[PDB]
Design a protein around this motif. Structure first.
Motif, PDB file in Angstrom:
ATOM      1  N   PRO A 292      -5.763  -2.033   3.881  1.00  0.00           N
ATOM      2  CA  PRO A 292      -6.860  -1.195   3.488  1.00  0.00           C
ATOM      3  C   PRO A 292      -8.340  -1.850   3.216  1.00  0.00           C
ATOM      4  CG  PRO A 292      -5.271  -1.246   1.793  1.00  0.00           C
ATOM      5  CD  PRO A 292      -4.794  -2.011   2.840  1.00  0.00           C
ATOM      6  N   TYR A 293      -8.322  -2.878   2.727  1.00  0.00           N
ATOM      7  CA  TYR A 293      -9.489  -3.799   2.253  1.00  0.00           C
ATOM      8  C   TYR A 293      -9.496  -5.056   3.021  1.00  0.00           C
ATOM      9  CZ  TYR A 293      -8.660  -0.158  -1.167  1.00  0.00           C
ATOM     10  OH  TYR A 293      -8.362   0.982  -1.790  1.00  0.00           O
ATOM     11  N   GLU A 294      -9.488  -5.210   4.323  1.00  0.00           N
ATOM     12  CA  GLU A 294      -9.773  -6.086   4.846  1.00  0.00           C
ATOM     13  C   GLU A 294     -11.550  -6.356   5.153  1.00  0.00           C
ATOM     14  OE1 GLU A 294      -7.523  -6.098   8.609  1.00  0.00           O
ATOM     15  OE2 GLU A 294      -7.288  -8.207   8.454  1.00  0.00           O
ATOM     16  N   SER A 295     -12.146  -7.263   4.554  1.00  0.00           N
ATOM     17  CA  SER A 295     -13.432  -7.166   4.484  1.00  0.00           C
ATOM     18  C   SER A 295     -14.161  -7.231   6.018  1.00  0.00           C
ATOM     19  CB  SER A 295     -14.005  -8.270   3.739  1.00  0.00           C
ATOM     20  OG  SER A 295     -15.398  -7.980   3.300  1.00  0.00           O
ATOM     21  N   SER A 296     -13.661  -8.237   7.021  1.00  0.00           N
ATOM     22  CA  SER A 296     -14.135  -8.281   8.078  1.00  0.00           C
ATOM     23  C   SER A 296     -13.846  -6.925   8.909  1.00  0.00           C
ATOM     24  CB  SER A 296     -13.488  -9.569   8.878  1.00  0.00           C
ATOM     25  OG  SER A 296     -12.182  -9.229   9.185  1.00  0.00           O
ATOM     26  N   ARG A 297     -12.895  -6.479   8.805  1.00  0.00           N
ATOM     27  CA  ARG A 297     -12.689  -5.172   9.463  1.00  0.00           C
ATOM     28  C   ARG A 297     -13.443  -3.957   8.953  1.00  0.00           C
ATOM     29  NH1 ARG A 297      -8.529  -2.888   6.832  1.00  0.00           N
ATOM     30  NH2 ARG A 297      -9.944  -0.954   6.516  1.00  0.00           N
ATOM     31  N   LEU A 298     -13.758  -3.848   7.553  1.00  0.00           N
ATOM     32  CA  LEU A 298     -14.678  -2.804   7.141  1.00  0.00           C
ATOM     33  C   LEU A 298     -16.125  -3.143   7.466  1.00  0.00           C
ATOM     34  CD1 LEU A 298     -13.487  -3.011   3.322  1.00  0.00           C
ATOM     35  CD2 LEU A 298     -13.245  -1.162   4.736  1.00  0.00           C
TER      36      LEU A 298
END
Ligand SMILES: [K+]
Ligand SMILES: [K+]
Ligand SMILES: [Mg+2]
Ligand SMILES: [Mg+2]
Ligand SMILES: [Mg+2]
Ligand SMILES: [Mg+2]
Ligand SMILES: [Mg+2]
Ligand SMILES: [Mg+2]
Ligand SMILES: [Mg+2]
Ligand SMILES: [Mg+2]
Ligand SMILES: [Mg+2]
Ligand SMILES: [Mg+2]
Ligand SMILES: [Mg+2]
Ligand SMILES: [Mg+2]
Ligand SMILES: [Mg+2]
Ligand SMILES: [Mg+2]
Ligand SMILES: [Mg+2]
Ligand SMILES: [Mg+2]
Ligand SMILES: [Mg+2]
Ligand SMILES: [Mg+2]
Ligand SMILES: [Mg+2]
Ligand SMILES: [Mg+2]
Lengths: 258, 67, 53, 185, 144
Positions: free
Chosen positions: D17-23
């Motif tokens: 839920p909290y992948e920085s690059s994906r976000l």
RNA sequence: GGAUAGUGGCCUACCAUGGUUUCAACGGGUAACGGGGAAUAAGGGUUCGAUUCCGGAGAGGGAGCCUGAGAAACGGCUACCACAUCCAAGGAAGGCAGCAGGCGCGCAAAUUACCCAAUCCUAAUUCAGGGAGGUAGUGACAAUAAAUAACGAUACAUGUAAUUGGAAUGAGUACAAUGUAAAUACCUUAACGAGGAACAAUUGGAGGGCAAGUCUGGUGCCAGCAGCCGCGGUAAUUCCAGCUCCAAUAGCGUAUAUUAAAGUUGUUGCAGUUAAAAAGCUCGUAGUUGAACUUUGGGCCCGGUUGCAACGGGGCCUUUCC
């Protein structure tokens, strides 16, 4: 359960009828009759879903109760009458006849025919037996019993039925090299020539069929219907003549119209 | 807009073949005023009790509950 | 030992909220985030920070 | 009862839920294509994953297999028709190599921008929503429309929707009605 | 070999051995014995209603302090008595003796959560209204 | 032999002593109706399947039976059992696991609405009937699509703020029309219907896992938070709040169950010296497993597929035959 069922739920109807899923909870249950439940086409389906003459079952009954429709030469005002394979459905208004034959995909195709051959129909000999008083008779695939058959007529043969007197006019013999319709199984709707008949005593007899394009398939003896000889079918074949094009060549045929 | 249409060969066949609701819509033979479905079902259920005609039992009713 | 069940929330000074302009809910808020993060509104603080001090 | 009605999900949420690059990549896509939420990106990723899975299952069969040929050329046909795939790279291994922005470009909201019908991607989204854009003789208010590469030449304003039509609008009508008195008469 | 039969005709031993050894798994054993129906005061259900019988101050485990303000609740379904935490700052003043409370699990499927010893349930509702909606000023507890 | 529609220990008479079982009989449990299927799934699997279709069974529990082609029928009857209803006390009458609806139970589930117009069914039957079925009501079960703004001008550094303007429109509201069996709603539209567009989006978080604060006030191992590790003992990034930020967003959180993660059930594919685990030791039946050897190799052909080569196939001899 306590007696015969009178309803036919949708999704339980034969798939060949191409009935809409979300139309109602039920499909027309074929009444008892000549051919079968699964192997038949109710007149309501033939009149509303294949020809679009009637918009609903009420209009189907309105068509049938004014004696327009006629099955095998008889009026047949029954809405769910089980018209099946090789039956002749003549409408006097919109004067035209149809022969109930299977298309290549296995559905009962709308097959317009002329009166000169709608006069008769073909019937596969289900059995040959001695009736009471020693009278021989032939039982055909459509439940017809015809007395005093030609003494050379055996089971799995085909007989041309006059359909005005209901007598045997001609008869084709089940033999290697004769034209056959496939009336069941995976190859339902295919037309070919008998190559061999494997006996399998006690079991089911098998038969090898070669279509015109040289495709060879084996099927049970139960669902092979002799319709004549090579190139000479006793009936008018539908648009595809039972060729069974693969999906690739079917796509090619479709996209040849561009 | 897309719809569906029928042209009957004569008004006689149109009256014979058209559904009554469509006829009532158009202006042909009008809606028959029957009672509501619940009231009709209750009425037929009431009639299911009396065996023959109701008058012969109404005579008994009047005699008994009239003294 | 009950009867101390409100030693903080009850004796917390009741600061009211602050009336501020509403936020542009939806695709507009996604727009706000995109402008606030990817078109270089300076919050770098070495590499990337998201809160002041 | 009647036959059951089939329904399917059109998206898939990320495993982490909290992948920085994906976000950050998702917010980049949302800003670039005027997307409402991450669910549109999830839906596009779900379709792309389905396409890639189909292509892989086709590739695992020997070439010139009838099923592989049929379903493959069907998949390239559909993808080139929507515009996602390149005419040059019709070999299904360049289907395996597709990306999410390829589908995000063929959006009606994206195309209304790329054709100059709007001044921003978000302006384009608003124009589609407010019943201002027609594809052929058909007003389309769905920003996710997947222009079929034959409607690209035909995207234009509606006969209704008084930006390319002939009507005077509504707030303009009210403004004129008040200006009739505001002028003095 | 690897200590298990490999023969092409050893499927019976393989499956019987797996059956025997699946009993060492917690969840399989619980499911096959139906422990949650016999044991497990919530008789296999996610929530349960009960009547508060007494407020309790339960001392938190080390290294913590600050007793946790639970309630002893007698479930309507089976009559079993359990202890349920009342989570928020306050929110014990919203729960009274003989009040009807909805209880949920504590998120650990037993095995009491955090520093609260022997408390596997939490209060979600009291008197038919949400404990969270009561902690917030959204709703008020019905008069009783 | 009887009985049955008919086979049959189905039952009866005589006879024989058989029949099943560690390849698990028999017994017990099932919060077990079976299947088509469902969830999750690299592969292998795990779990679920009361429930839209198919099959079975039941109509409070049993049993018996009439009619009928077909019922051991229950919106048929008879009896007992358990409930339970009227009564003038003599009697009489029951079966919602059909559709609504009520009580109860519970964490847990909707209208005592409209209609045969569609799907089909039944009947003496085109016409009647059908709570079958369809229509609407309730409905954040679940699923699809996707409003809550867009664009200019002023002032400063693409952005900025309560500096402003012209547009755009649906959420509703509503003539009508359509849709409908009659409606509702959708679709389409007269007119109305934005300016803090107040027509104002929430739910959870901001130590780590895990995206987001060493900001301010409060409390002071209290209150509370915290799935876990932990945070709170007077300078709390964790509580209670304000502000700000983050995540998902017409949804979001919590509990329970289950699946993947779990190569923590391991056939694929675990571990057993010391982490849990090699039986104290040997024999031994079932089970599992068990050395090698019997036509190989030449040759002549015909012949299909790919592009003369490769690969497949069929046939003749060779001590052999198909
Ligand atoms: K302590
Ligand atoms: K502590
Ligand atoms: Mg049966
Ligand atoms: Mg006998
Ligand atoms: Mg089961
Ligand atoms: Mg059961
Ligand atoms: Mg089931
Ligand atoms: Mg049950
Ligand atoms: Mg059933
Ligand atoms: Mg029964
Ligand atoms: Mg009951
Ligand atoms: Mg009975
Ligand atoms: Mg009943
Ligand atoms: Mg019944
Ligand atoms: Mg709002
Ligand atoms: Mg805070
Ligand atoms: Mg972080
Ligand atoms: Mg291990
Ligand atoms: Mg050890
Ligand atoms: Mg030893
Ligand atoms: Mg042995
Ligand atoms: Mg060997």
């Amino acid at each position: 359960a306590r007696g015969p069922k009178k309803h036919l739920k949708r999704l339980a109807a034969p798939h060949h009828w191409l009935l809409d899923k979300l139309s109602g909870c039920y499909a027309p249950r074929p009444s008892a009759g000549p051919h079968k439940l699964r192997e038949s086409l109710p007149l309501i389906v033939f009149l509303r879903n294949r020809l679009k003459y009637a918009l609903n079952g009420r209009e189907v009954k309105a068509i049938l109760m004014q004696r327009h429709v006629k099955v095998d030469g008889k009026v047949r005002t029954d809405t769910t009458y089980p018209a099946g394979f090789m039956d002749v459905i003549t409408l006097d208004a919109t004067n035209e006849n149809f022969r109930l034959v299977y298309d290549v995909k296995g559905r009962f195709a709308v097959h317009r025919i002329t009166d000169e051959e709608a006069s008769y129909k073909l019937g596969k000999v289900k059995k040959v037996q001695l009736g009471k008083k020693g009278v021989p008779y032939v039982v055909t695939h459509d439940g017809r019993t015809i007395r005093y058959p030609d003494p050379n007529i055996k089971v799995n043969d085909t007989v041309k039925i006059d359909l005005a007197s209901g007598k045997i006019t001609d008869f084709i013999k089940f033999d290697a090299g004769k034209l056959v319709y496939v009336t069941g199984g995976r190859n339902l709707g295919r037309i070919g020539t008998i190559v061999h008949k494997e006996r399998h005593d006690g079991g089911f007899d098998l038969v090898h069929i070669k279509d015109s394009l040289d495709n060879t398939f084996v099927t049970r003896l139960n669902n092979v219907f002799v319709i004549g000889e090579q190139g000479k079918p006793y009936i008018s074949l539908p648009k595809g003549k039972g060729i069974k094009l693969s999906i690739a060549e079917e796509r090619d045929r479709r996209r040849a119209q561009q | 807009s897309v719809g569906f249409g029928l042209v009957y060969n004569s008004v006689a066949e149109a009256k014979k073949f058209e559904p009554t609701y469509r006829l009532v819509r158009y202006g042909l033979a009008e809606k028959v005023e029957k009672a509501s479905r619940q009231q009709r079902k209750q009425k037929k259920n009431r009639d299911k009790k009396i065996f023959g005609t109701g008058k012969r039992l109404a005579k008994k009713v009047a005699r008994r509950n009239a003294d | 030992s009950l009867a101390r069940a409100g030693k903080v929330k009850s004796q917390t000074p009741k600061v009211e909220k602050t009336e501020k302009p509403k936020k542009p809910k939806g695709r507009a808020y996604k727009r706000l985030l995109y402008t606030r993060r990817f078109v270089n509104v300076t919050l770098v603080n070495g590499k990337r920070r998201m809160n002041p001090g | 009862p009647r036959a059951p009605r089939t329904y399917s999900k059109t998206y898939s949420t990320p495993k982490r839920p909290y992948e920085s690059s994906r976000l950050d990549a998702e917010l980049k896509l949302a800003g670039e294509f005027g997307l409402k939420n991450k669910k549109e990106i999830y839906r596009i990723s779900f379709q792309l994953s389905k396409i890639r899975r189909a292509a892989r299952d086709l590739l695992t069969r020997d070439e010139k297999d009838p099923k592989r040929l049929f379903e493959g050329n069907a998949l390239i046909r559909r993808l080139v028709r929507v515009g996602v795939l390149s005419e040059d790279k019709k070999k299904l291994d360049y289907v395996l190599a597709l990306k999410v922005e390829d589908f995000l470009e063929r959006r009606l909201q994206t195309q209304v921008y790329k054709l100059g019908l709007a001044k921003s991607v978000h302006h384009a989204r608003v124009l589609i929503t407010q019943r201002h854009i027609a594809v052929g003789k058909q007003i389309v208010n769905i920003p996710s429309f997947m222009v079929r590469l034959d409607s690209e030449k035909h995207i234009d304003f509606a006969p209704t929707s008084p930006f390319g039509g002939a009507r005077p609008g509504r707030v303009a009508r009210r403004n004129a009605a008040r200006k009739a008195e505001a002028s003095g008469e | 070999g690897k200590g298990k039969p490999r023969g092409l005709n050893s499927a019976r031993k393989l499956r019987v051995h797996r059956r025997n050894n699946r009993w060492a798994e917690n969840n399989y054993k619980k499911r096959l014995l139906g422990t949650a129906f016999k044991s497990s005061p919530f008789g296999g259900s996610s929530h349960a209603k009960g009547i508060v019988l007494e407020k309790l101050g339960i001392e938190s485990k080390q290294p913590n302090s600050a007793i946790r303000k639970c309630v002893r609740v007698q479930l309507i379904k089976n009559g079993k008595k359990v202890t349920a935490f009342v989570p928020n700052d306050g929110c014990l003043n919203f729960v009274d003796e003989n009040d009807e409370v909805l209880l949920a699990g504590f998120g650990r499927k037993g095995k009491a959560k955090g520093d609260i010893p022997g408390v596997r349930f939490k209060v979600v509702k009291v008197s038919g209204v949400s404990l969270l909606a009561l902690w917030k000023e959204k709703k008020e507890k019905p008069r009783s």
